[PDB]
RNA sequence: GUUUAUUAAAAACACAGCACUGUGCAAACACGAAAGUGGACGUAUACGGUGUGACGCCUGCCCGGUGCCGGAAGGUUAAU
RNA sequence: ACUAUGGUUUUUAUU
RNA sequence: AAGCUUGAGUCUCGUAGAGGGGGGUAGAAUUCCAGGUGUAGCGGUGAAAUGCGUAGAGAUCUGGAGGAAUACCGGUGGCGAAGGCGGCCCCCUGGACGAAGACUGACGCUCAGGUGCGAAAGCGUGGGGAGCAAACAGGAUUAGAUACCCUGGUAGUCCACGCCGUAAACGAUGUCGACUUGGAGGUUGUGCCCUUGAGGCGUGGCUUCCGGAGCUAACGCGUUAAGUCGACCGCCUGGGGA
């Protein structure tokens, strides 16, 4: 919830595809899901991270 | 919902001493001015019934403060009424 | 009033356009009694994807204190302008500024 | 504004009527009053060809300013007026140097309040600042697509032309046509919506209306003796046949088009 | 048990057979036993995933 | 309101309304060997044509046929 | 989770 | 006609939320249109057929058009009086809670009549039309069918603005007041952890399952009660008829 400038951290939480990696398989907590899936989001629309890689 | 601003210049004027918090005529004072913080918020349009019952619900607890005041002093009431905006 | 970082990605070589847009970015707060914290730099950066046959853009950020009953009004300086694309005011989130 | 009372006497039932406080209620600006005289609908041989043909009282025309340019030079409005032939309604304006003209009224705007002219004016309606400024999704008001023609679309009561693709040195057009029109942004594009808004709340009412309309209604085939009607008759009530116009012709699922020399500037059909 | 795979693996894990209801039902829910074996022990065992 | 001027004045003609169908504006339409003329400084709730008649509450079954449009290959078929 | 059919529809019995 | 306080309220700094209302802005899969590349299958089941192609469907590539809910996270989780409420982003907002001071001084409760408010469909003028779908053209089905099943599909769900006030509107528990008895989880503050720590051990709020007193024919209710009675309201006295 606190951030969304600095990349190397969200860079962990997405593939080379750009797509997010499930809780289930990063050993990563739910309620954290659910903020790093907003601070990927707020990381999107920065233009630093991709939407999707169509495009 | 009432500003820093707005509510400071209730208590400052609505009192007999130094930061005066409790009076009855500053708890009706206050109420009469958190309907005027709701300009803006309220009669814009039909879908919206929250401010209208906001609005009815200060207004409930505003008669049950006067109620009280005008049986218990009588003349704190016909006071508050040329200082406050009540009726015009 | 309310803290926004404000943050929108400007056209790379308007660069030089910049400090005059900044001129009459302060002055449209300034004139409303906000205070500024930064307004100078955060750097021309490559983007995740190209845009105008181009790879990068510049970012100034502004780190702001406004009234947030203006707020949208403001953000049309932004918006009529040509050289700038999706900005956004971005609020508080432990702002540069915390009343020291 | 609109105002409507219920039933009070026989015949004068519930009736609505439009009403403006607004719209000046003195006379046109003389000089800029001219008389819109008319050859008098007589075809190649000395008669008329349009049946029941007709009205208004004189449609004397207000000029309105189509051919301007101005830079700099600020205006004031004085008023809001209507023109016999049209429902876009007009705006008298003085400018600060100064003339008296009529303006194709734009929208957003009232009489004691000032505007500017050209490169150095702010994007409100009525400031005919340059079309190759503006972003996608400016309304432009009234456009004029060749030099010097006149007030070519948005023409008609709260219409307007909107921008919304540019190329360079080029802008298109969305247009109520349904069409995708391009220019090179040389438009006069005066910026915003036309008129008041409010044509559209009419009833017109009684059928004694119709005389001051100068329009004559249109009556059934059926109801004509077989002379002065292709569908006239006959007690059977029936033709028998396929429906034509009164000269004996069908058109229901025949489609008719003409033009084949605009193919370059058509880009979108409307669905 | 039964239930259609959702996600191919081809070695299975005994997550879903035989663990689960012979034996896994009613010999652990609700304080059956307790003491501090099926909570607070469990409590203090580490893991380097959550759980 | 219009109606058989001198046997027939109504239950016919038609309006906001319902629907079909021609029209994106150098519109469609009507007239025109030709200049053009009106539609029209109007611009799709605006314009042309035909059914039905405001309001209140509803809108059976049938495309075999005649007409009309779409699908466009083929056939017969004139100028060539 | 491991392979399709849909209708008829007792009267006296009990003294 | 005044006083008090453990009722009920005031002001300052902090805690959590798909609650409501308005603007800014992306995705995923589906559906049509144009021209290419151009081929024989493409569609649907419990089964079968209508559909769809030989006048060249389906699919695929680059464009154009376009609608509805925001899928994963989403929970033995929040929030709303409820009906209900999930992409990001920005304002405004009723309640609930941590916590140190200072101020009211019974200001509290219920409610006939009245008045506020839709999951749904119905009234209706103009826009919209991809999911799904009453109506409806057909395929059938079968002894039959108007149905199950299947191709297509309107009202309607969607939008602006108003009427209707519906339901199992089921949380089976009227609105208010003060009590009673243990355990365990989730969720949110707070004190202290050199945080085994999707936290731990106490303490405030909410809430779920198990369970004790009491109450019940039975389910069980079980401190948020079907318990204990105290305020006020609505309503009742065999079944059908109604």
């Known amino acids: ?55 | ?88 | 009033m309310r803290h926004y970082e404000i943050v929108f990605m400007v056209h790379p070589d308007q660069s030089e356009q910049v400090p005059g847009m900044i001129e009459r970015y302060t002055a449209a707060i300034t004139g409303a009694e906000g205070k500024i914290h930064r307004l100078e730099d955060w750097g021309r950066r490559q983007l995740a994807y190209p845009i105008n046959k181009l790879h990068k853009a510049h970012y100034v950020l502004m780190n702001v204190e406004a009234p947030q009953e203006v707020i949208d009004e403001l953000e049309t300086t932004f918006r009529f302008n040509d050289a700038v694309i999706r900005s956004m005011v971005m609020r508080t989130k432990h702002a540069v500024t915390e009343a020291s | 504004a609109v105002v409507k009372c219920k039933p009070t006497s026989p015949g004068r039932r519930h009736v609505v009527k439009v009403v403006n406080p607004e719209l000046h209620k003195g006379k046109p600006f003389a000089p800029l009053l001219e008389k819109n005289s008319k050859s008098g609908g007589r075809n190649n041989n000395g008669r008329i060809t349009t049946r029941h043909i007709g009205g208004g009282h004189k449609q004397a025309y207000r000029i309105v300013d189509f051919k301007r340019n101005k830079d700099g030079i600020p205006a004031v409005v004085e008023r809001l007026e209507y023109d016999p032939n049209r429902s876009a309604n007009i705006a008298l304006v003085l400018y600060k140097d100064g003339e008296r003209r009529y303006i194709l009224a734009p929208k957003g705007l009232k009489a004691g309040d000032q505007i500017q002219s050209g490169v150095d004016a702010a994007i409100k309606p009525g400031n005919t600042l340059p079309m190759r400024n503006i972003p996608v999704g400016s309304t432009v008001h009234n456009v004029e697509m060749k030099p010097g023609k006149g007030g070519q679309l948005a023409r008609s009561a709260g219409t307007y032309v909107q921008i919304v693709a540019r190329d360079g040195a080029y802008v298109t057009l969305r247009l109520r046509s349904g069409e995708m029109r391009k220019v090179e942004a040389d438009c006069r594009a005066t910026l915003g919506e036309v008129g008041n808004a409010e044509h559209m709340l009419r009833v017109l009412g009684k059928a004694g209306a119709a005389r001051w309309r100068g329009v004559r209604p249109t009556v059934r085939g059926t109801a004509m003796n077989p002379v002065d009607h292709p569908h006239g008759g006959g007690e059977g009530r029936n033709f028998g046949k396929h429906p034509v116009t009164p000269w004996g012709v069908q058109t229901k699922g025949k489609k008719t088009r003409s033009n084949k020399r605009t193919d370059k500037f058509i880009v979108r059909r409307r669905s | 048990i039964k239930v259609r795979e959702n996600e191919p693996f081809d070695v299975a894990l005994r997550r879903f057979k035989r663990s689960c209801e012979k034996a896994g039902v009613l010999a652990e829910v609700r304080r059956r036993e307790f003491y501090e074996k099926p909570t607070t022990e469990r409590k203090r065992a580490k893991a380097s995933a959550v759980k």
Not at chain 2, 49 to 71: I, N
Request: charged share 30%; net charge positive; proline share 1%.
């Open chain 1, 1 to 55: 919830e606190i951030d969304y400038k600095d990349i190397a951290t969200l860079k962990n939480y997405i593939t080379e595809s750009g797509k997010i990696v499930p809780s289930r398989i990063t050993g990563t907590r739910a309620k954290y899901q659910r903020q790093l899936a907003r601070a990927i989001k707020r990381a999107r629309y920065l233009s630093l991270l991709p939407y999707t890689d169509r495009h």
């Open chain 2, 1 to 88: 919902s009432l500003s820093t601003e707005a509510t400071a210049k209730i208590v400052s004027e609505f009192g007999r001493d130094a930061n005066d918090t409790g009076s009855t005529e500053v708890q009706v004072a206050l109420l009469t001015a958190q309907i005027n913080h709701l300009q803006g918020h309220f009669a814009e349009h039909k879908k919206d019934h929250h401010s209208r019952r906001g609005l009815l619900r200060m207004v409930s607890q505003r008669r049950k403060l006067l109620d009280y005041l005008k049986r218990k002093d009588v003349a704190r009431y016909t006071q508050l009424i040329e200082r406050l905006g009540l009726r015009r």
